[PDB]
Amino acid sequence: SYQPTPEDRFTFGLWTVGWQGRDPFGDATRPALDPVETVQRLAELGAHGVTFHDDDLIPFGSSDTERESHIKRFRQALDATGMTVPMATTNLFTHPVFKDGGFTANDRDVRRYALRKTIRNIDLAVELGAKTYVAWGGREGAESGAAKDVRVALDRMKEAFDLLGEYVTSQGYDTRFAIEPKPNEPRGDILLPTVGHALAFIERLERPELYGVNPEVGHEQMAGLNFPHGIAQALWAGKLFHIDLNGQSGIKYDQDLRFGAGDLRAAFWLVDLLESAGYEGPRHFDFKPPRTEDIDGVWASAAGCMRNYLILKERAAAFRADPEVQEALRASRLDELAQPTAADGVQELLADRTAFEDFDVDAAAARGMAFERLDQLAMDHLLGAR
Amino acid sequence: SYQPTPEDRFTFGLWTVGWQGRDPFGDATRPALDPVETVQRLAELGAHGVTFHDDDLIPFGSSDTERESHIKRFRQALDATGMTVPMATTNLFTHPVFKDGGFTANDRDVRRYALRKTIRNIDLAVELGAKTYVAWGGREGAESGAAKDVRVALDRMKEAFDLLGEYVTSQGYDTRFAIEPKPNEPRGDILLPTVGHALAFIERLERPELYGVNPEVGHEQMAGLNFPHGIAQALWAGKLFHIDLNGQSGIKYDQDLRFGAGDLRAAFWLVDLLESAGYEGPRHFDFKPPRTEDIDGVWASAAGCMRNYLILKERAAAFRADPEVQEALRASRLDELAQPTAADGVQELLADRTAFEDFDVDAAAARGMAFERLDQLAMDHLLGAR
Amino acid sequence: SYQPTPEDRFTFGLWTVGWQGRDPFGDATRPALDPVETVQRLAELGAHGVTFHDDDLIPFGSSDTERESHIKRFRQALDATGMTVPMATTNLFTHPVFKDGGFTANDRDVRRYALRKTIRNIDLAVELGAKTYVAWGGREGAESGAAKDVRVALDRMKEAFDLLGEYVTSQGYDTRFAIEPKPNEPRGDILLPTVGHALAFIERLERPELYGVNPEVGHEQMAGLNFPHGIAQALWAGKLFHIDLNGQSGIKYDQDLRFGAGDLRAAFWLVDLLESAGYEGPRHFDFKPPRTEDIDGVWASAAGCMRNYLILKERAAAFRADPEVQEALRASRLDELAQPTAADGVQELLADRTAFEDFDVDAAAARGMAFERLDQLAMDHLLGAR
Amino acid sequence: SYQPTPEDRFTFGLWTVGWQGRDPFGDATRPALDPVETVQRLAELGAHGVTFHDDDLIPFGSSDTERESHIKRFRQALDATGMTVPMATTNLFTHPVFKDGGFTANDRDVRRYALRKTIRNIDLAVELGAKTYVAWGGREGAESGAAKDVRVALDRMKEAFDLLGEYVTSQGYDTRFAIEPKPNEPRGDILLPTVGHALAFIERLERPELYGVNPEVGHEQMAGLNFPHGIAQALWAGKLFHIDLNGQSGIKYDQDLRFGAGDLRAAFWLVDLLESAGYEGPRHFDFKPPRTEDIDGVWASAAGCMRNYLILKERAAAFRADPEVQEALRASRLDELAQPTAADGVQELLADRTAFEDFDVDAAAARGMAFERLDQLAMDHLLGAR
Ligand SMILES: O=C[C@H](O)[C@@H](O)[C@H](O)[C@H](O)CO
Ligand SMILES: O=C[C@H](O)[C@@H](O)[C@H](O)[C@H](O)CO
Ligand SMILES: O=C[C@H](O)[C@@H](O)[C@H](O)[C@H](O)CO
Ligand SMILES: O=C[C@H](O)[C@@H](O)[C@H](O)[C@H](O)CO
Ligand SMILES: [Mg+2]
Ligand SMILES: [Mg+2]
Ligand SMILES: [Mg+2]
Ligand SMILES: [Mg+2]
Ligand SMILES: [Mg+2]
Ligand SMILES: [Mg+2]
Ligand SMILES: [Mg+2]
Ligand SMILES: [Mg+2]
């Protein structure tokens, strides 16, 4: 049964189990966690690696001697546990200088400072082993319409990601970027609000191949969108470089519940998709243990993230492996969807009378899709009533 | 003041003022309108053109002799009024044969029939003068997770749009396609749910240049997204081929209120963007006069669509033309957003100590953005209190 | 196994399995079902009874001979199967005359007609043995602000329910009313939009005890509310007279999915609540088999409604029965929540220095609620991982 | 012009212009404001009064000497400006001890502490002349289903309000309570989530007449509800004791934009309602100047709150005063809505053949409501296009 292994590739941010509980209406309920303690406890839980924002590891404002003490300590913990660092990112949202954005701040000097802060952390991420560098532009956007010309801000956003592509190319680094979309919060509306908007943006950059997406369950659900559908389009585009797993219960503030909570059936269809498409990147949890919890509650919430992924993996595997489900898929013509519509081109199609002139539209309209039966088989597998 | 002219390029679908009032809980409240009567009345209201789905003009199932009677009659009305037909589209949603989709139906023969129905109407649209052919895949999607493999459905969707690109290319037609996104309704989740998802999809087609988007105000608002922001990204990508104007009051069923209703400030920021970016396509209204109205109420609702666009155009023009607003934009550093972040490349940026080492982060953090003052000037212009 | 029997009190509307699949963008995909055939197919499935709108049983406009003939063949089917009719309701939304409302229509003659149509069906409901009479005011509301004065509409809505209470009291009928709330659709905004608004309104009627609520899963979820929370307040108020069970996947158009679909964890906490509070009314399913389905998919969807309630009942019962869960509830102090705050009274609380001046606020702040461990035990029980 | 004077009853919380800009992803961008400076800058702006949470005026944990000193300098500022204190409230959400609630915390000692903290501030509110005492239960609720038994929590919530009613009655205080509803944030789901739920709960308290509601624009809009509709029901119930005015752009995190921003047409229909129903309470602004702003942007945002109410008051007044609008209201039969449906009574309605057996349902169905023309006249008046 459900014990995490290194092969499950479960990772967690320093900021997830390290969340102190501070929210818009309340102070911290927990003490700050030491990164070294977090690496050790996560290694004991069966996680494979940890990720970080620069300001999680090195206190904003640290002198270069305090910086290397922090880095050194962290790296001894990693080396002692065998924990990996698959991804890293920059905090371009906490400090008041980023109140109007990092890469798309109206003030040019803030945009330059944002880029220098990011490059300093790309060098660190690369020596720690990170292959993905995430960008969450949480402050890029607006609360009012004339505060941001969005066509000019997209020029500044393209310009910042192109300069970053330039830099990693000239250094010969093997890192790839993954843009993390979110529709709103903390800005009234955030630029590149969904997976689709981030995908389309990448196609306009100088080096498209260096950039993919880091979609998060709760973010797409804050726009009422189907997260497994958005992940299937990112996989179809070859751009799912990383993923953030957690839970969200509707269109409201961003909750970051542990994975499995929130929309449980969407979590099931997501694990089924990730596992049958053979996604091989980290299964990263970007969640917040509720501020009602003490530190024992924090590790119970982190353990529940992994446990729920493994139960859903087991149930999805059993659903697809079941002969009855395989027969129900044929009955709903999922095999026929995999056949080309018109492989002999549009002239064969135009000549075929059975495709239009002689098509019996009413016989075809009367065929049932048998979708409810197939979805109740999926419901029975998820609940273990099969 | 606010009289529609031909230069305003206002157009309406046959199905908008022709909506009979039928909804999921109620029967029709109005009689069916004759297309000829609609062309004449819209021409009297000051509209520039009309659009149509094939089944609006020619009754589904018409023999080829009844088809040409309908077409002939319509074309005499257009010719008598000088009304244009800038866009046309296919109905791939009403008939029960399309219950699981047109282009991405699981049944291969339905997908072939969908493509033949569409090509027949592209030929008609081209001889009537349409330069844009819209595709709204209202039935492409699902209510349950195993009913549609979305990666395979995107293959079938790419395949259908590529066959259509093939066909118009081989015929030498000057039509371009515009995909119309919608997140849900009538399917639980519709494929390519937002402007961003449709933009990203286009980049994967064989002939990307033939395809753009037809975004609709209320559709992006059904996902709680900022519609002026999504339009600015489609304009930045060079893909705003057409637009559908109406109103929506929140995340709920698709209302199609007349333009100006619903989110009035978003309507203001949309007209400001369309007018200052010099969009030159039709201002098309895809709206439904509420079923509470009789035919006099239908033409009053259609007239209100145009009237509201012209009042907002006038207010947005006055906002941007005001010296005080121009001064407030400089104060919020909207001019500095138009300056390149690092035009002398990443090595100049890396060497600049003022960009990091010597950057006074606290002086910069303390600068106010002056955004509330600028937005209250915009509020005063919209309300005519300035 | 999970076989329904009439002992489980499962009931279905004639309009549910009977929906023909017509939606805002599509025509019917199924033929009309004969009520007699519905009564015996539902009896075969293990249902306990059926409910109806007047217009589901007797076609609008039937002559009295035709009316009596429909009632006759229906009642014969009831007698033959042992099926009961627990509830009935009026259709005050389909006919065009109800386009601005039934009870709160601006036209006074339509409000009188709405009342006569309802009274006629109350007499029939009582003859068939219905104990609850539902009123869903789906047309009471507005799309625009000046169209409905809402304080005056609530006077007309109170007036209508007061006259229906006077009528059944004069007749000595044992029937009570249950108001069914819905936030929107088919009107832009519907009056009494949630459970709370309907509960508050009832306290203003002349005979408050004759009226309760008939909440529906998907309706409260269309406003992003927690449906188990809404039901606990209705049960706390002693007003849960009936309940409509189905599924909804978020804030969008009203889907009416089969129960168990949509928010599955909310369905689990709902069955946990109804079963532990000892609700004794009908478990009524107001759902629509998707229009993708044929008649065999209709009965599979209906059967799935009952199966899912019975699986969730079993898991909720096993959860509450588990000693480890019972121990986790004590650790989270749910036993202390049941203790009175200040049964000693106000002056004793004011004299209690340990309640304020000597309360150690930091020792209390430091106690973790242990809610994540508890919620993961609930997750394990729902998935059958114990 | 639109200059506020104290005659307009505009009031502001100390926590509003006083917000320092700390949010879930960011630190403060503004220094703390001294209450004394807020009182005189707001008096200069034309405000009538200020409101407070205990912890806004007296820092949590102040010794009684420090407490009295804070109250002293505040009261001196009040006396010097002629500013009033119409309302006050308790902070039962910021301190970590309130992480699972104040009045419905699972820990009994915290619920007693919550009551003592509130009573202490009721005595201070009454001394400063407050007539309304608001209770916003922002921590009463849950993120998971078994963490809070909601029927027992509502017994504890009733118990707490009953004891506060007993306390002010024994003291002979002339102060009434107003419950402030909010659907979520900071808890996953908050108890009494909307106006209707709070209204329904009040009818179960021991002294219902001591309690009403303090609805907030953005809170009801976080559940997609019509705020003018919610306010008309509270006014119909005689329970609108206070109101919080601000803006919200849809269903997402609570934004607290300045009034007039967000849904501008809902702000117009809200001022129309408050002004035509003769609401006489404070027009209170509970908003947050965006963290992008400096202290000058704080006072511009505050001034904009008042300016927008005064512009919308003028347009709503001109709308209702227009003979053409008065004629349009008669055409839409808003005068007939005010007529009793059946003042002749139930048996006369039953004997009226014109109400049913001789009602021409198709002539009534054919009458248009003329609501679009009416709504466009309201649009013209709001935009000043007449
Ligand atoms: O909602 C907030 C974001 O998801 C944030 O937590 C990012 O994940 C982090 O900045 C790394 O990308
Ligand atoms: O919401 C429905 C769609 O917007 C529909 O009305 C399309 O506009 C039409 O099929 C032409 O594209
Ligand atoms: O969403 C609509 C309602 O659920 C409606 O169908 C009612 O259930 C019916 O009028 C009788 O109860
Ligand atoms: O969104 C939160 C509430 O608006 C809160 O700030 C209340 O207004 C305050 O506790 C006193 O009324
Ligand atoms: Mg998040
Ligand atoms: Mg994330
Ligand atoms: Mg629409
Ligand atoms: Mg459209
Ligand atoms: Mg429903
Ligand atoms: Mg119902
Ligand atoms: Mg708020
Ligand atoms: Mg408030």
Separation of alpha carbons D247 and D256, rounded Å: 6
Dihedral in degrees, nearest 10, Cα atoms B141, B145, B149, B151: 80
Q: What are phi and psi for residue B283, nearest 5 degrees?
A: -95, 90
Give dist(CA B102, CA B120) in Å, integer.
15
Sheet containing B244-245, strands listed edge to edge, beginning at the edge strand earlier in sequence: B211-213, B176-179, B132-135, B87-89, B49-53, B10-13, B283-285, B244-245
Closest CA to C60 of C5, C98, C33: C98
HSE-CB of D247 using CA atoms within 13 angstroms:
26
Burial category of A103 from C-beta neighbours within 10 Å (exposed 0-12, middle 13-18, buried 19 and up): buried
Task: Calculate Rg over the CA atoms of chain A.
Answer: 23
D55 touches chain C (CB under 8 A): no
Ligand 5 centre and the CA of A306: distance in Å?
18
> Tokens 């080829």, residue?
B64
Chains that touch C (3 or more CB pairs under 8 A): A, B, D
Please list the residues that pair with B261 across neighbouring strands. B259
Q: Report the first-to-last Cα separation within chain D, whole angstroms.
A: 18
Method: X-ray
C-alpha distance from B331 to closest chain D C-alpha (Å): 12
Residue D298 CA to residue A99 CA, distance in Å, equals 15
Encoded tokens for A161: 């990601």
Angstrom distances, CA of residue C255 to CA of A269, C283, C292: 19, 19, 13
Nearest to B26 by CA among A237, C95, C223: C95
Place of tokens 């919608």: B182
CA neighbor of A288 nearest in space, from A9, A4, A33: A33
D92-121 as b/e: b if 16+ CB within 10 A? bbbbbbbbbbbbbbbbbbbbbbbbbbbbbb
Neighbours of C173 (CB within 10 A): 16
Euclidean distance between CA atoms A264 and D52, whole angstroms: 42
Nearest Cα residue to atom 2 of ligand 2: B138
Helix (H, G, I), strand (E, B) or coil at C139: coil
| Test mutation, C271, C376, C381, chain A, max A CBs within 10 A | C376
Task: Tell whether A238 lies on the interface with B, counting CB pairs under 8 A.
Answer: no
Spatial contact of A144 and A107, defined as CB atoms under 8 Å apart = no
User: Angle formed by the axes of helices C295-321 and A371-382, to 10°?
Assistant: 10
Q: Which of A6, A10, A57, A29 is closest to A302 using CA atoms?
A: A10
* C-alpha span between B12 and A354 (Å, rounded): 35
Q: How far apart are CA C72 and CA A15, in angstroms?
A: 69
Are A315 and C383 in contact by the 8 Å Cβ rule? The answer is yes
Ligand 2 pocket test: pick from B103, B136, B245 the residue with the most ligand atoms within 8 Å of its Cβ.
B136
Rounded CA-CA distance B233/B196 in Å is 8
Beta carbons of B245 and B286 less than 8 angstroms apart? yes
∠ CA A21-A25-A26 to the nearest 5 degrees? 40
| Ligand 2 pocket member B138 (CB < 6 A) | yes
- Whole-angstrom distance, CA of residue B224 vs CA of residue A2: 38
CB atoms within 10 A of CB D135: 23
Provide the angle, in degrees to the nearest 10, between the axes of the packed helices A295-321 and A323-331: 70
Is residue C324 within 8 A of residue C67, CB to CB? The reply is no
Cα(D116)–Cα(C353) distance, integer angstroms? 10
Domains of chain D plus CATH, in order, are 1-386 (3.20.20.150)
Closest to B201 measured CA to CA, from B186, B175, B179: B179
**C44 is annotated as contributing to ligand binding:** no
How far is residue C264's CA from residue C262's CA, in Å, rounded to a whole number?
6
Residue B312 three-state SS: helix
d(CA A168, CA A123): 9
3-state helix, strand, coil in chain A (%, to 5): 50, 10, 40
Task: Return d(Cα C87, Cα A229) in angstroms, integer.
Answer: 40
CB atoms inside a 10 Å sphere around CB B68 = 12
Tell me which residue of C222, C130, C216, C218 sits closest to C180, measured CA to CA. Answer: C216
Would the CB atoms of B261 and C144 count as touching at under 8 Å?
yes
Asked if B330 and B322 count as a contact pair (C-beta separation under 8 A), the reply is no
CB B204 within 8 A of CB B111: no
Tokens of D114: 């919550």
Nearest residue to A197 (alpha-carbon basis) of A160, A249, A157, A252: A157
Distances (CA, A) of A220 to B194, B199, B223: 12, 17, 10
In this structure, the residue with its CA closest to atom 9 of ligand 1 is A136
Rounded distance, CA C258 to CA A371, Å?
A: 12
* Helix, strand or coil, per DSSP, at residue A160: helix
Per the DSSP assignment, residues forming a β-bridge with B10 are B283
Asked if D53 is an active-site residue, the reply is yes
The 3-state DSSP class for residue B339 equals coil
Is A55 a residue of the active site? no
C89: enclosing H helix or E strand = strand C87-89
Beta pairing, strands D283-285 & D243-245? parallel
CA atoms in the 13 A half-sphere facing the CB of A371: 26
Which of A303, A351, A329, A308 has its CA nearest to residue A42?
A303
- The alpha carbon of residue C315 is apart from the nearest alpha carbon of chain A, in Å, by 9
- Give the C-alpha separation, B46 to C346, whole Å: 73
Nearest residue on chain B to A350, alpha-carbon basis: B116
Q: Which region, left, alpha or beta, applies to residue A140 given φ > 0 means left and ψ of -120 to 50 means alpha?
A: beta
DSSP C202-245: HTTSSSGGGEEE--BHHHHHTTT--HHHHHHHHHHTT-B--EEE
How many Å lie between the centroid of ligand 6 and the Cα of residue C376?
A: 22
Q: Is residue D151 classed exposed, middle or buried when 0-12, 13-18 and 19+ CB atoms within 10 A define those classes?
A: middle
Q: How far is the CA of C14 from the centre of ligand 11 (A)?
A: 43
CB D87 within 8 A of CB D133: yes
Q: How far is the CA of C3 from the centre of ligand 10 (A)?
A: 24
CA-based nearest residue to A180, from A269, A88, A260: A88
Q: Is D386 on the interface with B (CB under 8 A)?
A: no
SS3 readout for D31-78:
CCCCHHHHHHHHHHHCCCEEEEEHHHHCCCCCCHHHHHHHHHHHHHHH
Task: Give the position of tokens 């109804």.
Answer: C274
CB B173 within 8 A of CB B124: no
Q: The tokens of D328 are what?
A: 């349009």
Q: Which helix (H) or strand (E) holds C156?
A: helix C150-171
Q: How far is CA C33 from CA C22, C40, C48, D162, in A?
A: 14, 12, 19, 54
**Within an 8 Å CB–CB cutoff, is residue C49 touching chain B?**
no
CB distance B260 to ligand 2 below 6 Å: no
CA distances from B10 to B87, B305, C31 (A): 12, 9, 41
Using CA atoms of C241, C246, C252, C255 in order, give the dihedral in degrees to the nearest 10: -120
Q: How far lies C31's CA from each of C22, C291, C295, in Å?
A: 11, 11, 9
